[PDB]
Design a protein around this ligand. Structure first.
Ligand SMILES: C[C@H](NC(=O)[C@H](N)CCc1ccc(O)cc1)C(=O)NCc1ccc(C(=N)N)cc1
Ligand SMILES: [Ca+2]
Length: 223
């Protein structure tokens, strides 16, 4: 997260860290057994880390649980990042408490101008690199589809939306991948892609979760 602020420990209790020896992606807890993240985060050897603030220090509220199954969206296209969503089932159910809590799925899509909270442990610099160890947060509005498509001609699909600031300075970034965009209590987006980070006229692009709620619900019910 570039241009954000330190969230505060466990203030984003649905935020998970995906760990394969090291943090590599965010995700969002959607019930005690399931996390949703980005398909571009797919790999083997995933341990889900819940209740994290400092990902380098055991602070006392963590739960570490291995993935038992990962399901990349059936239509994910890695060339275009279309359908960039993946479900991860946990080997055992997380114990839900104030610091480890699910986030609701959309009941409908969200409109341009709606304000959202984006969070993660990704890069905090727009040029060069600096990775924080505590969770960072950013408030950002959803941008119009037309400004999104104008910023990224030939690359925005119906399963994507832009959020952030066209002026630059405030954005998600590498390492925030797969993490949440929460707007009025609903998980509307997943950190997906963009050109650089926090650059002028290059806002963040996010998976449009409202398009996937039926798939998520049916997949969880059958698995
Ligand atoms: C795997 C993904 N790749 C890209 O983003 C490429 N530059 C375009 C892919 C690509 C997409 C569509 C296409 O049609 C072709 C290639 C990535 O690195 N995500 C982390 C990220 C990146 C940016 C931001 C941000 N600035 N908000 C946040 C997290
Ligand atoms: Ca920790």
């Amino acid at each position: 997260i570039v241009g954000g602020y330190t969230c505060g420990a466990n203030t984003v209790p649905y935020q998970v860290s995906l760990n394969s020896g090291y943090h590599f992606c965010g995700g969002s807890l959607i019930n005690s057994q399931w996390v949703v993240s980005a398909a571009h985060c797919y790999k083997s050897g995933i341990q889900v880390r819940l209740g994290e603030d400092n990902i380098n220090v055991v602070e006392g509220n963590e739960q570490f649980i291995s993935a038992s199954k990962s399901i990349v969206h059936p239509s994910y296209n890695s060339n275009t990042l279309n359908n960039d969503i993946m479900l991860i089932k946990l080997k055992s159910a997380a114990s839900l408490n104030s610091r480890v809590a699910s986030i609701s799925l959309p009941t409908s899509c969200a409109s341009a101008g709606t304000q959202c909270l984006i969070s993660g442990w990704g890069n905090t610099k727009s040029s060069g690199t600096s990775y924080p160890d505590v969770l960072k947060c950013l408030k950002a509005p959803i941008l119009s589809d037309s400004s999104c498509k104008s910023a990224y001609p030939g690359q925005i699909t119906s399963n994507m939306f832009c959020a952030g600031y066209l002026e630059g300075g405030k954005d998600s970034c590498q390492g925030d991948s797969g993490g949440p965009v929460v707007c009025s209590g609903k998980l509307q987006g997943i950190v997906s892609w963009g050109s650089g980070c926090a650059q002028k006229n290059k806002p963040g692009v996010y998976t449009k979760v409202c398009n996937y709620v039926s798939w998520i619900k049916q997949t969880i019910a059958s698995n």
